[PDB]
Each structure stands twice: as C-alpha cells, then as structure tokens.
C-alpha cells in the first residue's frame, strides 16, 4: 500500500506525481528535497488513515 498520488500545498501550484522508492525513509529525503525545490518549506504531515503526505508550511 505504497501511497500513489503525492499531493503537494500550493495556493497557485498544483499537481500529482509518483514515483517508487527502496523504503518510507529513503522516500522521506526525495520528497522533502522534491518540497524544497518548489520553495516549500514546513513541517512534513501524514496520515496513516489515508496513505497520503502533505508539507504544512
């Protein structure tokens, strides 16, 4: 149950994407870096109860 649509936090930015990854920590680094390179900083959200990551800024 890897989770399939990435959804990033922007008022005039929006978009899905997904990719694969080795484990959730080796996700974490591409996705928080993916977050950066948009100039999206925050604190990193998650909700098990919907397989989904969301930055809060």
């Not at 005039?12 to 990719?19: A, N």
């Not at 390179?37 to 800024?57: I, L, M, R, S």
């Amino acid at each position: 149950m890897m989770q399939y649509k990435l959804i990033l936090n922007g008022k005039t930015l929006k978009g899905e994407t997904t990719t694969e990854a080795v484990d959730a920590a080796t996700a974490e680094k591409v996705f928080k870096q993916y977050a950066n390179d948009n100039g999206v900083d925050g604190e990193w959200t998650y909700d098990d109860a919907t397989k989904t990551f969301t930055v809060t800024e």
